[PDB]
Amino acid sequence: HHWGYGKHNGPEHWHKDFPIAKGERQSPVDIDTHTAKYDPSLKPLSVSYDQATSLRILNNGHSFQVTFDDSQDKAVLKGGPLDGTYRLLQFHFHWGSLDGQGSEHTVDKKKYAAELHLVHWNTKYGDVGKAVQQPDGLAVLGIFLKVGSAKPGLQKVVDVLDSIKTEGKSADFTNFDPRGLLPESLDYWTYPGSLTTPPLAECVTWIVLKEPISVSSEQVLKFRKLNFNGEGEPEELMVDNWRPAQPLKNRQIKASFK
Numbered sequence: 001h002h003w004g005y006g007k008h009n010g011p012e013h014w015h016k017d018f019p020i021a022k023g024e025r026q027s028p029v030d031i032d033t034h035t036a037k038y039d040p041s042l043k044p045l046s047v048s049y050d051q052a053t054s055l056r057i058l059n060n061g062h063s064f065q066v067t068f069d070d071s072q073d074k075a076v077l078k079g080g081p082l083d084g085t086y087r088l089l090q091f092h093f094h095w096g097s098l099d100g101q102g103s104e105h106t107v108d109k110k111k112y113a114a115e116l117h118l119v120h121w122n123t124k125y126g127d128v129g130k131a132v133q134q135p136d137g138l139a140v141l142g143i144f145l146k147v148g149s150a151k152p153g154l155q156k157v158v159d160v161l162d163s164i165k166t167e168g169k170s171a172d173f174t175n176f177d178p179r180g181l182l183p184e185s186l187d188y189w190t191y192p193g194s195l196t197t198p199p200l201a202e203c204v205t206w207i208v209l210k211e212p213i214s215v216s217s218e219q220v221l222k223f224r225k226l227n228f229n230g231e232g233e234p235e236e237l238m239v240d241n242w243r244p245a246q247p248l249k250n251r252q253i254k255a256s257f258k
């Protein structure tokens with residue numbers, strides 16, 4: 001039926017409704033650190049998040065997401081491999097049922113406990129619906145989470161998850177500063193790819209940060225208490241909402257660092 005992450009509707013089934021699932025620039029991929037090419041032409045990333053305005057947090061039945069006001073150039077991503085200004089729209093996570101799985105991208109086959117996606121769209125296309133139809137429409141910053149010490153900047157998110165336990169629930173979520181989610185270093189890998197959920201459009205410049213952030217076991221445990229189901233339905237824990245690595249095909253992964 002409708003897509004999801006289960007045995008009968010999971011990633012291996014998506015191609016029947018979304019044939020681009022077997023396309024030429026699908027995501028995620030395994031990053032082979034010894035075959036990635038250092039590209040000295042790549043610029044440092046410019047992340048300008050000081051004026052970000054968060055609006056709401058919502059359980060969309062596949063993940064939870066925090067949405068931002070993107071009606072002006074308030075929180076923007078520029079530089080790196082990008083040409084032009086990309087506005088922050090939302091962030092969300094992918095995570096596992098166990099600490100040794102949950103990320104979408106992998107690094108030399110290593111899986112992390114979760115992966116944070118900060119989604120931005122290219123302002124030259126005017127709105128995000130137009131941007132997803134363009135090969136350079138979106139830029140997604142991917143950040144790995146490892147289990148270790150707690151991340152204090154994540155705690156405001158963890159503490160509101162009880163309010164959005166089931167599909168379709170939303171809550172006001174103002175004055176959240178996404179700078180608290182970034183690692184110290186902005187070194188990155190980049191490659192052209194796709195959304196990792198339907199409709200799997202091939203519109204994404206991926207920027208995957210090398211340095212993971214550390215979150216505590218108690219913080220990630222709280223993600224695993226969310227539900228895929230809506231209020232009143234059989235309880236199905238929201239875990240393992242990650243797509244497996246896809247073939248690299250004719251693409252090169254570039255590194256900003258040696």
Ligand SMILES: O=C(CCCCCCC(=O)Nc1ccccc1)NO
Pocket residue numbers: 089090117119128129132140194195196197
């Ligand atoms: O695929 C990803 C990362 C990119 C997610 C892109 C979602 C875009 C969004 O929130 N709004 C939108 C979706 C479809 C069409 C237009 C806007 N993770 O699974």
Ligand SMILES: [Zn+2]
Pocket residue numbers: 092093094117196
């Ligand atoms: Zn994602």
